[PDB]
Amino acid sequence: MELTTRTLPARKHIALVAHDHCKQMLMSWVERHQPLLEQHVLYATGTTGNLISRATGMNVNAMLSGPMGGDQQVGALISEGKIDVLIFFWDPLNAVPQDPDVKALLRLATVWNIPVATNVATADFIIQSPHFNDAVDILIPDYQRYLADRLK
Amino acid sequence: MELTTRTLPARKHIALVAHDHCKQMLMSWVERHQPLLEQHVLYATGTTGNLISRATGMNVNAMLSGPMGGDQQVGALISEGKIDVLIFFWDPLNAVPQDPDVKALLRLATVWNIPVATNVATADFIIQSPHFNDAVDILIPDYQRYLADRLK
Amino acid sequence: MELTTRTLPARKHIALVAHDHCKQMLMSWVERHQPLLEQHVLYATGTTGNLISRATGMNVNAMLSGPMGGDQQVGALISEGKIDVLIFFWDPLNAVPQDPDVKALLRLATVWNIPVATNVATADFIIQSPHFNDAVDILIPDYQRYLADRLK
Amino acid sequence: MELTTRTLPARKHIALVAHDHCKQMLMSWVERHQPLLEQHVLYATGTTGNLISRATGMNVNAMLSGPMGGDQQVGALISEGKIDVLIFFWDPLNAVPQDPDVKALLRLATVWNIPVATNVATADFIIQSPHFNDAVDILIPDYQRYLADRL
Amino acid sequence: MELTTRTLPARKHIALVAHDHCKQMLMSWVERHQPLLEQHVLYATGTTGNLISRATGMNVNAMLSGPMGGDQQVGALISEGKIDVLIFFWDPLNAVPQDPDVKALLRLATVWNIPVATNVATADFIIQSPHFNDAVDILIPDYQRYLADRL
Amino acid sequence: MELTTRTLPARKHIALVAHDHCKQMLMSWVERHQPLLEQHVLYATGTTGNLISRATGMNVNAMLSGPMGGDQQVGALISEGKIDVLIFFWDPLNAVPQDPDVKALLRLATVWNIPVATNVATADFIIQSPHFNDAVDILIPDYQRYLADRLK
C-alpha cells in the first residue's frame, strides 16, 4: 500500500529481548558493546531488563515479562514509532507458550521496517554498521492514507 | 500462592475489535446497546473505532488498525490493567495475516482474566449481567511474586 | 451469510473442559456454583469429567480425553446444536500437543454463536446472566442456505 | 503408553474429504475406483459428499461442511473407532481458515493409527493393498489404561 | 494447475523419519520388513538413520538431525524428485519446537504427490501394496509451465 | 549446548528470496547495491532469481519456487553451511500457503546464526557493515557433539 518516510534518530531507542536459553548470549553481547549501547536509549522485557541493569549498571526501561504481555508492549511501541531497533534472541530449539506473541512481534518489526536481529551474527553486523549512530530515513506504511481508504 | 486481586471499576473500559466480515455484526450490537455503552469508556482498533464513532456519535478512543499493530496496543493496555472488558469479533471463516496477533491478544485476555466475548451470544450474556455496571473483583496473577521468583 | 435462529433450552447443555494446569481452577469454580450447575446438563472431556463427578457427586457425561479426541467430540456436538454453553479453561502459559484441536474447538464455538468462557471472570459473568436459566434464542448461520449455495 | 488392538472389518468405513481446489482430483479418483468403493461404507463432509452422490450415484453419509464442523465430526468418528480409512485431499497451495481443524483431524488419524491418504499416490497404494478388502488387526492406544492412570 | 507425470523406479528411494517417542515403533517396523527394505535405497534424518544402521546393518544415507535442518534436507530431495516414499512417524501427543519444519515437510510431500505414511497402519498398507516394487507413474505439478506463467 | 565456530568467507554466498508483494522492493534494492553484490555469489528462489538476473544481468543460482520447495532447498543449504547471508522479504500483510516453510526457514537461519534481513532497513545495515566483505568467524552449534549425545 501507500508508503511514507520516517527518520530513525541518531540516538536509537533499542529494545532488547531474549528467551531463557538465549539470555546468556544476549548478556555477553551487551557486555561486549556496552560503551556503544550506553550512547542509546535502552528498553527490554521484564526479566531481560533487570538482569542487564543489575549486571552492567546500565539504565534500562523494563517492560512486563514477555509471557505477561511484555512482547505486545514492545510491539505496540514499535507501531507507535517509539522503538528504532529490535534485538530479539528467541529460542529456535524450544517450544514457547507465547509463540503467537513472538510471531506477532517479529511480524510488526518487519512491517514497520526497523532493523531487527534474531541472532548474534545479525546483531553484530547491525551495531558495527557505520550509520548505527546516524539519522536514517526509512520507508514505512502511510497509516493516514491506509485508514482513509478504509473509511470510504 | 501465585495470584492476587484486581478490582474492575463500575465504569468499565471496553475494547471493541472486529474483523471486516464481523463489523456489521458489531455495529448492530453496539447500536442496540448504545444507552448502556454510553455510560462506559470505549476503546477500539482503527477502522472499527471510527466507524462506530461516526455512526453513533459516541466518544471512542481509536488505536491503530489491527494489521498495523492495533491488536498489540490493546493487548498492552490489557496487561497494564487499563482494559476491563474485551469484545473481539474475530472472523472464524476467513484466514487473516495478523493471525498470530489475534491469538496473542486472546491469550493475554485469558491470562489477565478479564471478561471476553468472541461472539454476539457471549457479548449479550456479559452485558446483561447484574454487576456489569458495578465494581467487581477478579483474580489476576501476582506479577510481583512472579518477577521476583524469576530474578532468584 | 444467511442467518436463522435456535432456542437455547432453559436447562443448558454445558460442556466443561480444562487443561491440566487449570483443572484446580475449574474444580473450584464448579464447586462454588454447584447449586446452580445442578440444574443443568453437564458434559466434559474424560479426565475433567471424572474429577468433577467424583468430587461433587454431580452426574457428568464424560467424553474422551482431549488429546485422544475429546475436544473434537465436543466440537461436533456444538455444531450439531447439542451443546449450549462452553467453559474451556485452556492454559495460556503452556504449549500443548493438541493445540490445533484447541483452536478448532474455539473456532467452532465462535461460528455457532454460543456463550463461551476461557477464563473465570467470563464464566462468572455468563452464569450470573439472567437468561442463563431461561430459554433464549440465538442467531446461528443458516446451514441449509449455506450448503445450497455451495451446490449452486 | 500401553497399546491394544482393533480389527478393521473387510467392509471398510471410509471418510472422503477434499478442499475445493482438490475436489476435482478426488472426484476423478473416486470415479475410476467406483466398482470397488461401492463395496464399502462411504462417509464425507457436506459439499464433497453431495458432489460424489450425484456424480457416481453411490450412497454417501454426508456430514456437515468442513468449515462448519464437518472435520471435527469425522475426527469424532475416528476416535470412536467408527472410521477405518481416511481419504483427505487437503490443499497444500492455499491458506484455509479451518486450518486448525485440518491439522486436528490429521493429528487424530495419526493417533488412532488408521490408514490415511493425503494425496492420489498414497490413495492408490492403499486401495490396491491386500488388507483393504479384508479384515486386519491394527494396534491402537489403550484408552482405558490411559484414562485410569490419569486418574 | 498444469500437471505432468513422473515415474517412480521399481527400486524406491525411501526416507525414514521419526520423532523420539516414535523411534522404537519405527525400529520395529523396519526390522519387521527388513527383507523387503533391503532391496531399496534408504535415507533418514540424523539420529533415526544411525539407529537403524547400527541395529540392522543396512546402509542408510543419514542426513542432519531434524531440528538441525534434516527435515528441510528431506523436503528438498522430495521436491527434486530424489525421494519416492516418505515414512514420517511424527509425535501426535508431544509438541516439538521444529513443528513448522514438520508441517512444511508434510506439505511438500503432498504437493509432489508421493506415497506418505504417518503411522504404522498406513506404512504397512503401502509396503504391502503390490506395485511397491514396480515402476509407478504419478501425477505431479508441471513446474516448467508453472514457472513459465510466473514470468 | 556445545558450540563451535565457522568462518564466513570474504566472498559471501547470498540467498535472495521475496514474496510477490515484496519483489519490487527487493528488485530495486538489488539494483541500488549491484556494485557490491556483483562481488559475491547469489542464490534465490525460482521466480525471484530469474527476475533479478533478467533485470540486472547478474548470475543467480536459481532454486525452485518457494511454494514448490524453494524455501526448503535454501534451508538445506544453510544447515549445510553453504549459505552465509539470507535476505528474505516475506510479506507480513498477507497469509501465505507455505507459511510453515517460511517459519522453518527463518528458524534455521536463526539456529545457524547467519546474518538475516527481513526488511530493507535491516538489509541496508547489513550490507554496509565493514565485515560484509571480510572473513568472519561466527558461533555455530557443534553438530558432531550434538549428534554424539543423541546416540549415547
From Swiss-Prot, chains A, B, C, F:
GO CC annotation, single: cytosol
GO MF annotation terms: identical protein binding; methylglyoxal synthase activity
CDD domains: MGS
Organism domain of life: Bacteria
Influence of pH: Optimum pH is 7.5.
UniProt key word Hydrolase: no
Enzyme kind, highest EC tier: lyase
Signal peptide: none
EC code: 4.2.3.3
Activity regulation (record text): Inhibited by inorganic phosphate ions. Competitively inhibited by phosphoglycolate. Competitively inhibited by phosphoglycolohydroxamate.
Keywords: Cytoplasm, Lyase
UniProt entry tagged with the keyword Lyase: yes
Binding partners and assembly: Homohexamer.
Annotated function: Catalyzes the formation of methylglyoxal from dihydroxyacetone phosphate.
HAMAP family: Methylglyoxal_synth (MF_00549)
Protein name, as recorded: Methylglyoxal synthase
Organism for this UniProt entry: Escherichia coli (strain K12)
Organism lineage string: Bacteria, Pseudomonadati, Pseudomonadota, Gammaproteobacteria, Enterobacterales
